[PDB]
Every structure is written in C-alpha cells, then in structure tokens.
Paper text:
The crystal structure of PAC1R ECD was solved at 1.9 Å resolution with R and Rfree of 17.6 and 20.6%, respectively. The overall crystal structure of PAC1R is very similar to other previously elucidated ECD structures of CRFR1, CRFR2, GLP1R, GIP1R and PTH1R. The three conserved disulphide bonds hold the core of the PAC1R polypeptide together in a sandwich like configuration. The orientation of the loop between β3 and β4 relative to α-helix 2 is constrained by the third disulphide bridge between Cys77 and Cys113. The sequentially invariant amino acids, among the class B GPCR ECDs (apart from the disulphide bonded cysteins), Asp59, Trp64, Pro78, Gly101 and Trp102, are placed in the structural core of PAC1R. The structure is further stabilized by an interaction cluster formed by Asp59, Trp64, Val93, Arg95, Trp102 and Tyr109. Although the side chain of Asp59 bends towards the β-turn, it is still able to make a salt bridge with Arg95. Furthermore, an interesting feature is that the bond between Phe106 and Pro107 is in the cis conformation. More importantly, Lys20′ makes a salt bridge with Glu104 of the ECD, which is the same conserved residue in CRFR1 that requires the positively charge residues (R35′) in CRF and urocortin 1 for the binding to the receptor.
Author numbering: -346 to 119
Amino acid sequence: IEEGKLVIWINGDKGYNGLAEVGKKFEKDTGIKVTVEHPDKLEEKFPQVAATGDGPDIIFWAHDRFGGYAQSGLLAEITPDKAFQDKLYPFTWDAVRYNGKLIAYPIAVEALSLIYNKDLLPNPPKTWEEIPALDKELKAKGKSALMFNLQEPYFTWPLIAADGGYAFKYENGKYDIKDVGVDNAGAKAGLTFLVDLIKNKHMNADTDYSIAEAAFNKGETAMTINGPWAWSNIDTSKVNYGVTVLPTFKGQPSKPFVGVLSAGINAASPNKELAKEFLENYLLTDEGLEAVNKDKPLGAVALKSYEEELAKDPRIAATMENAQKGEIMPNIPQMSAFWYAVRTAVINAASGRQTVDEALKDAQTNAAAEFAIFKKEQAMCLEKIQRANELMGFNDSSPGCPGMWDNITCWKPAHVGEMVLVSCPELFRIFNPDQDMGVVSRNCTEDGWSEPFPHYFDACGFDEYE
Ligand SMILES: OC[C@H]1O[C@H](O[C@H]2[C@H](O)[C@@H](O)[C@@H](O)O[C@@H]2CO)[C@H](O)[C@@H](O)[C@@H]1O
C-alpha cells in the first residue's frame, strides 16, 4: 500500500491478534506501523488486487498457493542470509521453493487431526468404519459422533487419500500434471464412504466450518477434524478434548495434506526491506512465534529453537504423527485447478448432483486441464472490468456492485437493483456439451452481489438437451 508502513493479510482462523502484537513491538522499535487484516477469501482476493498493484505488503497462506502467485510474478524473491536459513527446518524451506528460488518465509507446519471429546468418547475409534455405529449409540443420548467442514475439500481429503487417492503424481523429482490420482479405486472408496455417512444421516451435507466448530465446542458432537488453530477456541469452551491420530480407512492411515503456513512479500510493495526485517527479526523469533501461538496455535513451527521448545505438547505430537502419514501439498500453479476440481466433486457427490464415480471422473480431468481456462478467463475478466470502470467514468456513473472475477466467470459492475446475466462458461462443458445454452445470473442488491442464481452447477452442469 504505502511507503513506510506494513499491511499484512492472514486468514481469520489464524492468530491475527497475536501477530498484531508482534506488529506493535515492531513499530515501538522501528517507528514503522503494522496493520494486520483478515479479509475473507484472501487467497483468491490476493492475485486480483495484487495484480492491480494494491495488495497487502505481506500475505500469509499455506504454501500450496504460492507457486501460482510466483508464476504470475506477484511475489518478491526473498533474500534470507545463510545464518537465517539455518535457523529454519530444510523441509519448510522446500515448501516455499519454486523454480529454484525461495518465494516466501515458512512459519509453521500444519496437518489435520482427530479432535475428540474424552467425556463422550473416552476411547476414540481407530477406524472410520466404526463411526456409523458410534453415531447411532450417541444419537440415543441426543449427541452425534462426528461433525467437520464438508464445504472445503482440505477436510475430506484425508479420507479420500487414505486407501490410495493422490493429487499430482510426483516421480523423479517433478509433478506430472497429467497423472492425477483422484479417480482411482481408493479415492472412489473414500468418497463413497463419506457420501454414505451423509445418506445415513450421520452428517449433513451443508455442514461448514463454523457449524462443526460450534457443535463440537458446545459438547454436542463427540469428534471433529480440524487443525492446530482450532485448539484455542476449544480451550475457551472448556470441552475435555484430546487430539489424536485420524481413523484408518480400509486398514490404511488417513492421509491429510501437510501445509506450511508461509509469508510472502508483494512484488509491488515499496517496503520489501521493512517486510524482511519484520519477518526475519520480529516474527521468526521465539518471542514472535510465542505471541502468535498463544493466540491460535500454529502447529509445528519452522523455527528450530521454538519448535524444540513446544515439541512435548501432545497435541503437536499428534499433529506431527498425522503429518507423517500424510503428504506435503504441491505448490505448482495447477493446485488452484486441483482444489476447484475436488471441491466441485465433493460438494456434488455429497449433495447428490453427481454420483461419486462421475464426480471423480470429472475431477481427474479438471485438476489436470482446467488451470489454463482459469488463467485465460481471469486475465480477460480483469481487462473487461478495467474497460467497464472506464466507461462508468465516461458516463458519470458509480458501481452499485463492483466488477469482479469470482473464479468462475466475470461479473461487470452493476447498479443497485440490476440483475446481470452471463453465459455458462466453457469450464462447464466437460459436464454438459450444451453448456453454451445455459445462463447464470446475479442480483446487485443493497447488500452487494447476490449468490449466483441458479447455483453454477444447477445452471450449467446438467445437460439440458437430451
Ligand atoms: O479446501 C481447500 C483449501 O485447502 C487448504 O486451505 C486450508 C489451509 O491450508 C489451512 O491453513 C486452513 O486455513 O484451512 C484451509 C481449508 O479451509 C489450501 O491451503 C487451500 O489453498 C485450498 O483452497
């Protein structure tokens, strides 16, 4: 944003108040102010606003998004000295290395665990297969066995990958974009098992993060699946909780993705030197990380000295046990297509819009082949919005709802009270050869843009011509 000031974005689930405390120490010593914000959907927001030169100076996200940011050139190469590099674990530096260059500072290693209420379930299940019978028993006490976020595929991935699902195949040191493991026997069985839990009313398809959290933290469900950041709210709730290895599926460990929370510096920030100093000399210290960790736990931190200090925490131990059974996320630019593909597949199979076999058949192609469409359409969208904003100027107009790219298609700026129609985008043709007949709308209201009507898959994904 502005010279002589640091703006930082970080997810609203993380220790942002803790990070702001490090910010306050920074400005006390340097005179240079630090504002920490937690925009919704910042990982997508970032490439849009950072592409126009207006991001934060620093963005925090798991490392999987950073190769895409790097490729788009939205990230400054970082310059830590040999002394500093030695203070963090090699494995965490690898997570932020892209085409041979370091593109962010690693902060902490995250993996999902099984979090369970010890009073409801003193001996938690070792197997996913045991869960339906546990739920039946608990429901007779007005309690349920398990609730977790079903809207974000990050949370369902451990079960999909358990019996052999994978994202991109890694062989001979590189990811093969064409070899996507979301549609093999293991992945199918995993997603089928999830869909059966919903069918049998052990879970509801619409369950999201805040719903699952609220249910666990009020003592209503015996288990959830969540990361280290969630432990602080559970502490506040006084639930007697344990954090443990995820259940097995078909005898195999669940295989969560491992993320390294990382901090990248905007390539357009004028304050790259200030950004460096904050990250290297304030945040990545025992004291900086303690401040953040005490707000919302980070997991296993990248800084060796502090990771050693924390290592006996049994909840971190469980985290590390689940991470060892899991796999590091790729950081390749195509991970954005992978996550689109699998989120679509899980939401569709869970809601009955597609069968599991069709959902996954399509996701395998979409993970491999959709990124180029996304990139083309995103770039065309930014151009259309620029043109539209210019014409609003020429017409003495102002946008009721701003022009935006929503990862699927382009919405021109609109007046309050105006509906906008767009053609179904080419993206949906894999589902529907007649997607070119489809139309999707949004309404520009006093409360901003409405959600798409119909929902995108309903509008665009079912072949409407037999
Ligand atoms: O569900 C897809 C989503 O998964 C990961 O995001 C995680 C993030 O890594 C965690 O730190 C925590 O914030 O929860 C997120 C899931 O809601 C990937 O990092 C992300 O790029 C992907 O879209």
